[PDB]
Amino acid sequence: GSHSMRYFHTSVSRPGRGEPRFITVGYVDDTLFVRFDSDAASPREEPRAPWIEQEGPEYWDRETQISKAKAQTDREDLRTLLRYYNQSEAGSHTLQNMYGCDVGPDGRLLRGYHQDAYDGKDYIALNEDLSSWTAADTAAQITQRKWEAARVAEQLRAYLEGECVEWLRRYLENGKETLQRADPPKTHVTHHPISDHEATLRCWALGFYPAEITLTWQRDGEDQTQDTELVETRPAGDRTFQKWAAVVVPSGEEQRYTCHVQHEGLPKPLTLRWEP
Amino acid sequence: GVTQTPKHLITATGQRVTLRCSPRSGDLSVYWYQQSLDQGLQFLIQYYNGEERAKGNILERFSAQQFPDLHSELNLSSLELGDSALYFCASSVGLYSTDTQYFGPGTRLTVLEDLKNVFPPEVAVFEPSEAEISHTQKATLVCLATGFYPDHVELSWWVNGKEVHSGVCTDPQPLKEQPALNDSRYALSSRLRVSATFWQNPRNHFRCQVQFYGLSENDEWTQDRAKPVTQIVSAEAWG
Amino acid sequence: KQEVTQIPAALSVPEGENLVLNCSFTDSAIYNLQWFRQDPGKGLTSLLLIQSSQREQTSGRLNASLDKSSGRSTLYIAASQPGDSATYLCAVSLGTGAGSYQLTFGKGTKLSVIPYIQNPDPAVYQLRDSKSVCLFTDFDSQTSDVYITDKCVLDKSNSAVAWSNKSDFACANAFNNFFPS
């Protein structure tokens, strides 16, 4: 269906400890494929997926040069934002940035992205029309006027309309076996007697990709979404994800509760009960 | 907006020169470039808000610095023959990759072995021919600068005390008199086309001004001949 | 690793013809591509700035392209006027070292848009020195002790100057390679 490529950036200042720490990652859907850490013995854009090692040395030389330029620019922005907000130079501040593009099944662009944040709150972002900005405060409007005079959005619209969607299609083709093939979840239900008259039914969903999944319990036809303990989708570690939902069921009525799982890899939603 | 100082520099081998540059008021980054014939425009060093940002293959004997007033200086020490090139200065608003740089007029540096062969030009205006005024109803005046070295000359015409540019042709590059000698003298010609009635009127005054750039004060001079200092040799004519 | 190259070195074209100036650059993290014109006296003046992801930029009679995959650029000049005669430099801002960007220029292509000679009126005149030279003019741009200057149409007609400090030198016969009596 719809696919996306994302690039995350994080810069945390280390006053007196040296250079600020810079960590950036790249994602195609929910799959990490590139990485660059400033605290590396030899910092270079490192691969994290098997279908990206196929690129030549000139590819990794550009991505490393670009990541190092983003690090040195973020290092200057950390000093600049101290003047915008009149903050002390002895405090640690965080600078975050994320840009990317979304494509649908037709291979065309759906939406471009470019957002920035300072100390966890929004700072300045590129609007959906790829031609205007949205500043969060008066200090962010200073950056807005400088980026509009330098025509920064003119390069962003060319990248998001062109280089972002074109390189995403070649990544989806080179990784067609992992990015375009969805892994259905492995489902099962466990029983845990909390007391002699009460029990808990837990519906499991393990080893699925992507992370988008919906676990909903139903008691003989009606959902108990309010009192269903659901945990956030967690990564298993091998590019797969896990999720479970639990309900406090009175003892003896276990066969009146059904679990419904929805995932893109399933042709139709599954229905599972305890099965003792 | 970008200004450089000085404009021309003629010096000897082993000397030291200072190149000043004043960027635009809104520009915080300064760039230094060197344009030689064998390598073209080559990047030297870049300064941003007083600190060094980027650095090319600049030699150790080339020193630069950006001052808190954002103006930059470039000291070229132990000059050699190969250092004779054009030195440009550029400035940009900041470090934006979507913005452009703005170059200045450029400082031309010429380094010689000895200043003995430096000569000022000899100028002479030539009045038009009567066969031309009856054949083309226009009059052309020729200005010839002869016997100068090096080619740091700026020719300009002045009619009735004001510089003009229409009907003016100036040779793009000076020609050598004797192409066999190592440091040959240079020559430069120029033309001024005016109406045949304009030249026939004896009340109009034509003047060919040649701004020659020679030795600065820093260079010594022990020869009996006059110092080949940056001077102007002119020649005038009336209708 | 970075070395921009422009071909050809020189180019002389009659007025009115469309032009194409090629430019090739090496594989690097280019940030933009510019085309500068260099005039005598005046410094460099920007003409077109192509962004990193852009493939075309236009402004009047100038249309430049950019292809990072092949690493080539092309500047298209339409309706070549005599004012367009200058040296055209191909500049790119590539990522150098570690985190720095450096604007690298090409060798340049000098251009001479030859204007139409309205009336080929070849004539050689002998001018007289003031307070005390041979002029070959209006020759259409076709085909030791005496110094001859090159023709001057762009800084309008042709003009060639020949002089000599010789008592045998005759203004009528410069060399074999309208003469008024």
Partner: peptide, 9 residues
């Protein structure tokens, strides 16, 4: 590929 952009704040 990443975005080739240098834009300080």
């Amino acid at each position: 590929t990443r975005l080739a952009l240098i834009a300080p704040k």
